[PDB]
Amino acid sequence: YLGRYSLVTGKHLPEPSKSADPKSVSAIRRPGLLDGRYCDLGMDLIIEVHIPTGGSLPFTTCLDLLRVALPARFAGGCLHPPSLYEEYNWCTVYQDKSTLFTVLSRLPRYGCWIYPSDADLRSFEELSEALALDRRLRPVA
RNA sequence: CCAAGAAAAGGACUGGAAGAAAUCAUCCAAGUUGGGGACUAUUUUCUGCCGUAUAGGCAG
DNA sequence: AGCCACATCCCGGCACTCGAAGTCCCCAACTTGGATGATTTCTTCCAGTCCTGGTAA
DNA sequence: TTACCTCAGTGCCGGGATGTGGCT
Numbered sequence: 001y002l003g004r005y006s007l008v009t010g011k012h013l014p015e016p017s018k019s020a021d022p023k024s025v026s027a028i029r030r031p032g033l034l035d036g037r038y039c040d041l042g043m044d045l046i047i048e049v050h051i052p053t054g055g056s057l058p059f060t061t062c063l064d065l066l067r068v069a070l071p072a073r074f075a076g077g078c079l080h081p082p083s084l085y086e087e088y089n090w091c092t093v094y095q096d097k098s099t100l101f102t103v104l105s106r107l108p109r110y111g112c113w114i115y116p117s118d119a120d121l122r123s124f125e126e127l128s129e130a131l132a133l134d135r136r137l138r139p140v141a
Numbered sequence: 142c143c144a145a146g147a148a149a150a151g152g153a154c155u156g157g158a159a160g161a162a163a164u165c166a167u168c169c170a171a172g173u174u175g176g177g178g179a180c181u182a183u184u185u186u187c188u189g190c191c192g193u194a195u196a197g198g199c200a201g
Numbered sequence: 202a203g204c205c206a207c208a209t210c211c212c213g214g215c216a217c218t219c220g221a222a223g224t225c226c227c228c229a230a231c232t233t234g235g236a237t238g239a240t241t242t243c244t245t246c247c248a249g250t251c252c253t254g255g256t257a258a
Numbered sequence: 259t260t261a262c263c264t265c266a267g268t269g270c271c272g273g274g275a276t277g278t279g280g281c282t
Contacts, residue, residue, distance in 0.1 A: 016253085150253105156247105158245105211276100214267105
């Protein structure tokens with residue numbers, strides 16, 4: 001789900017990790033420069049979790065472990081939880097489709113859900129026509 | 142276990158000078174707001190003595 | 202046909218009403234005629250510097 | 259070291275009881 005999307009201009013400067021000469025030189029050079037594109041995100045995820053064992057562990061302990069397991073890296077950038085001074089339960093679990101869907105219907109109108117497409121495209125010209133006709137269609141990797 | 146893993150763009154700076162928006166002008170004519178009506182009830186405030194006294198002070 | 206488990210079912214029981222005036226009805230809402238001319242819209246000079254290749258002679 | 263190369267209602271609540279359906 002996409003709530004915020006901001007494009008950032010410019011490009012990163014590399015660390016001076018390369019000596020100017022291998023020996024008898026006290027000068028440091030810059031490896032080289034690349035031209036990329038970066039952005040800041042705000043997003044929610046809904047993961048379908050399954051436990052093979054007949055007896056499950058729906059406990060506070062597991063909610064702590066779900067907070068610990070969360071990676072710090074995402075899409076090459078840095079991932080953070082919501083700020084501490086305004087913290088609420090950002091890591092809830094549902095075992096009912098009716099309760100979960102009801103809560104999701106309340107999301108702000110200016111955000112986007114991203115769904116899989118049906119169309120089969122074999123060229124950029126076919127993509128050009130599909131994009132001219134729809135307004136909801138986007139190419140992705 | 143993410144076109145994966147690591148990363149300091151920094152240092153300095155004078156926009157200035159000068160100016161005439163002006164002349165003219167007719168909003169008018171007519172007009173029916175009207176007819177009817179309960180603030181008191183299950184109220185609480187009585188009965189006396191002193192004092193010239195509808196003044197002022199008192200017991201029950 | 203006889204025996205046992207599990208469904209509900211109806212009477213006795215229990216708890217609530219709850220303070221505490223009323224505030225006007227109905228029908229109509231304007232026609233006509235015109236919106237100005239003549240003139241002009243700036244000129245001088247300037248527009249940084251340095252670092253951040255791979256490959257083979 | 260260097261050179262190269264791009265656009266009168268109602269709502270729970272207890273408790274004993276009436277009655278029933280399946281197995282032997």
